[PDB]
Amino acid sequence: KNILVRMVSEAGTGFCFNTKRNRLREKLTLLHYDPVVKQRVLFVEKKKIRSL
Amino acid sequence: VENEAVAPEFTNRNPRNLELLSVARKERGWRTVFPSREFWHRLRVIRTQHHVEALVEHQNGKVVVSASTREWAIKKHLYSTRNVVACESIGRVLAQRCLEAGINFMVYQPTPWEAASDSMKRLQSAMTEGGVVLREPQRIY
Amino acid sequence: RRQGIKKMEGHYVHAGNIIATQRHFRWHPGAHVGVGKNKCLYALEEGIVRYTKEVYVPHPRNTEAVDLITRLPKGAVLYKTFVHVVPAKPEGTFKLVAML
Amino acid sequence: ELTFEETERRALLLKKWSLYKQQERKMERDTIRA
Amino acid sequence: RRTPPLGPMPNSDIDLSNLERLEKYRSFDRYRRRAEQEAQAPHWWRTYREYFGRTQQLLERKQAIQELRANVEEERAARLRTASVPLDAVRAEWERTCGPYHKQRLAEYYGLYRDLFHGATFVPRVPLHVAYAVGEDDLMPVYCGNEVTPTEAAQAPEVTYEAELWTLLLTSLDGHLLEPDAEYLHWLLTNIPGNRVAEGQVTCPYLPPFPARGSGIHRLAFLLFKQDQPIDFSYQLAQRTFRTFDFYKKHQETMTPAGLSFFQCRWDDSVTYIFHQLLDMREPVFEFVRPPPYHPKQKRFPHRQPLRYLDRYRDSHEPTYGIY
RNA sequence: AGAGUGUAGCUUAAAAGCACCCAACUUACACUUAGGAGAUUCAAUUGACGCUCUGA
RNA sequence: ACCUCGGAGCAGAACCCAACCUCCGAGCAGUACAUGCUAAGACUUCACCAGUCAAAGCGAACCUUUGAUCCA
Ligand SMILES: [Mg+2]
Ligand SMILES: [Mg+2]
């Protein structure tokens, strides 16, 4: 199944956004727009929010 | 002063006034149909069996500036009127005529294979080096 | 579903008004008529709504429509119903702001 | 790799075969119609 | 119920049972050409258009083409896609041959005919040439629809045309400031002897173009009329205003238009100079004002509307306090 | 001997558009892209050089 | 067995509807991580709740099936 995860910005900001990834799939690292920084920055998966 | 009697509302009757101000409307519909009508002037190329022809046509359908290799004045200077050389020559002639007619901006609507065509690439290059830009400015709302 | 035409021919329509809601492309967008993600037809300008029948030339990237049109006899032309908005007001006017 | 003279000869050969098979198809069609 | 068609239904003439024996559109472009032809063709149903609407010369041409083809260098260049074309020679030849027809198209598109002669057209037989001398070394030409600044058009232009009398006129079709239909004449030479222009009768002195700021782009027309026999004719706007329509009505018996060349003028500092120095008046400034945005009639209870609904109808953005 | 007479294959086209051929992509066809070849039968609307038909 | 939603029958021609009923599938999957932010004007399952579309603008790049409040 899929799990909702909290991608947390690697830019030092507290900005986090939620994505969906397969449980069997590896932890996610993804480029995403940082509104506070106003630039695309890397985000890393921190913790599993739920299992959907 | 009688010379300063100016009407409160000006009435510019030049058909190209708002188009050149980049304020006139473009027909923004027709999404399910090709080609799009969202232009003021369009570059249309007709490649027949023997002749290659180019038109600069307003949105209303009026043909504004044409260059046909059918015409003697141009066909008397090249070998074949149905090749890349003919396309480039007609493109340069049309670019000169567009500049003399004041049409600096245009829209070109090729099919994917027309765009991939080397002759059409040469025609676009000829137009852009002649001064005509094949991309109209956005409308100002 | 409550779909169908919301503005019949001759109806005055303001920019943004939904003209027709549809599941398929029963009516096609004409002049100054945009299409939503769900094929809803809305007015891009303020004016009068007109329904016409026009020759249908599908976008070349539309593979199914291109196949349909290539499987067609040499004299046939497809027709579709199009919805246009005939704009009423001009884009604007030039007004004397100052006599410098 | 290839040179310019051989390319020109290839183009001339293509043109001459164009003419030759054009005459061939023309005469075949003439026989058909006759 | 079914009302019968009011004419030939499309795709009815070819509607035959031999579909397999009927040649088909093997390609998209042939269908596109047919569809464009059909769209151009008139129809009995409502359509988008309803609402949004010598022998020796031939022999010489054939011989010249044969010579050009026979030239092996030309064939080699063409097959190598490297040949070029003399633009100046092509321009001159086109001007002589079919340039007047294209210039008539340009005039019709620019609305010169409908706005000057109320739709009455003609053909610019004489390949007229006008050019405003910029500085001393060069001179900006005035083609059919050119773009020339009033700074470059400050002084009167040099006119050349291979012909033999002539009346030359300049109008601003849309520069009028009071009456929409009228127009301003800028300079008018009459009874031109052949080609030389300095000997022309200067009835109205030369005026540079003066398009007001933010008033758009104005179209200025050089008219040239063939003249049979001279006729006596006749810095103030009331006397510079006139209508080419009735003006040429008063002279069409002996004058016939044979030349046109027109250009577009925008605002420039020379226009400030023109308005102040010699017109002696405050220059008008125009702004393109769009109509106010449409909002539906305000409701007492704007159900399901956002809070911005009230802002859509309030006029002043500053806080108000009523009686307090 | 007489009639119809006549633009490259077709054109109530006026030197054009469709047709036509190869080269590459196709098993192949097709598409597309590159190229190729083409005519108003001879003299002043008329007469005579060629084709079809009607006879021997 | 069903109870919500969606698609088809089931309504021949705006909408609405043959409830009950017949069949199918969804409590999603894939994709992207601007698949953002804002905002005229509209639609709407006949109330409300809810649910849709969207010009212009700003910013990046260059989408195809459900569940309120409270409470944690
Ligand atoms: Mg149902
Ligand atoms: Mg409702």
Coordinates of C-alpha atoms in Angstrom, one line a residue, chain E residues 211-318:
Chain E
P211 CA 0.5 62.4 -32.9
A212 CA -0.5 63.1 -29.3
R213 CA 1.1 61.2 -26.5
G214 CA -0.6 58.0 -25.5
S215 CA -3.0 58.5 -28.4
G216 CA -2.0 55.4 -30.2
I217 CA -0.3 55.0 -33.6
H218 CA -1.4 57.3 -36.4
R219 CA -1.3 56.5 -40.1
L220 CA 0.0 59.2 -42.5
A221 CA -0.6 58.8 -46.2
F222 CA 1.3 60.3 -49.1
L223 CA -1.1 60.5 -52.0
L224 CA 0.0 61.2 -55.6
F225 CA -2.4 62.2 -58.3
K226 CA -1.8 62.4 -62.0
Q227 CA -2.8 65.8 -63.2
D228 CA -4.1 66.8 -66.7
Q229 CA -4.3 70.6 -66.5
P230 CA -3.4 72.8 -63.5
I231 CA -6.2 74.4 -61.5
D232 CA -6.0 77.2 -59.0
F233 CA -6.8 75.9 -55.5
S234 CA -8.6 77.4 -52.6
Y235 CA -0.3 76.7 -38.7
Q236 CA -4.0 76.7 -37.8
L237 CA -5.9 73.5 -37.1
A238 CA -9.2 74.9 -38.3
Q239 CA -7.6 75.4 -41.8
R240 CA -5.4 72.2 -41.7
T241 CA -8.5 70.1 -41.1
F242 CA -10.2 68.8 -44.3
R243 CA -11.7 65.7 -45.9
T244 CA -9.9 64.0 -48.7
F245 CA -13.3 62.6 -49.8
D246 CA -14.9 65.8 -50.9
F247 CA -11.5 67.3 -51.6
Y248 CA -10.9 64.7 -54.4
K249 CA -14.6 65.0 -55.3
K250 CA -13.8 68.6 -56.2
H251 CA -10.9 67.6 -58.4
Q252 CA -11.6 64.1 -59.7
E253 CA -12.5 65.3 -63.2
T254 CA -8.8 66.2 -63.9
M255 CA -7.0 64.4 -61.1
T256 CA -6.6 60.6 -60.8
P257 CA -4.7 58.8 -57.9
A258 CA -1.7 56.9 -59.1
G259 CA 0.6 56.8 -56.0
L260 CA 0.4 55.9 -52.4
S261 CA 2.9 55.5 -49.5
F262 CA 1.9 55.5 -45.9
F263 CA 3.6 55.1 -42.5
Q264 CA 2.9 54.9 -38.8
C265 CA 3.8 57.6 -36.3
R266 CA 4.1 57.3 -32.5
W267 CA 4.7 60.0 -29.9
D268 CA 8.1 61.6 -29.7
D269 CA 9.7 64.7 -28.2
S270 CA 9.5 66.4 -31.6
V271 CA 5.8 66.2 -31.1
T272 CA 6.2 68.3 -27.9
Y273 CA 8.2 70.7 -29.9
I274 CA 5.6 70.8 -32.7
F275 CA 2.7 71.4 -30.2
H276 CA 4.5 74.2 -28.3
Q277 CA 6.8 76.1 -30.7
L278 CA 4.6 76.5 -33.8
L279 CA 1.1 75.3 -32.9
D280 CA 1.3 77.5 -29.8
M281 CA -0.9 75.4 -27.6
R282 CA -0.8 73.0 -24.7
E283 CA -0.2 69.5 -26.0
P284 CA -3.0 67.0 -25.3
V285 CA -2.1 63.8 -23.5
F286 CA -4.3 60.7 -23.9
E287 CA -4.5 57.5 -21.9
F288 CA -6.1 54.2 -22.9
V289 CA -8.8 53.8 -20.3
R290 CA -10.4 50.4 -20.1
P291 CA -14.1 50.1 -19.1
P292 CA -14.7 49.5 -15.4
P293 CA -14.9 45.8 -14.5
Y294 CA -18.4 44.3 -14.5
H295 CA -19.8 43.2 -11.1
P296 CA -23.3 41.8 -10.6
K297 CA -25.7 43.8 -8.6
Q298 CA -24.7 43.7 -5.0
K299 CA -26.9 41.5 -2.8
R300 CA -27.9 42.1 0.8
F301 CA -26.8 38.5 1.6
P302 CA -23.8 37.4 -0.6
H303 CA -24.4 33.7 0.2
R304 CA -21.3 31.5 -0.2
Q305 CA -19.3 34.5 -1.5
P306 CA -15.9 35.2 0.0
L307 CA -15.2 38.2 2.2
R308 CA -13.7 40.0 -0.9
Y309 CA -17.3 40.4 -2.1
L310 CA -17.7 43.6 -0.1
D311 CA -14.4 45.0 -1.4
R312 CA -15.7 44.4 -4.9
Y313 CA -18.3 47.1 -4.3
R314 CA -16.6 49.5 -1.8
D315 CA -15.1 52.6 -3.5
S316 CA -12.8 54.1 -0.9
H317 CA -10.1 51.9 0.7
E318 CA -9.5 54.2 3.6

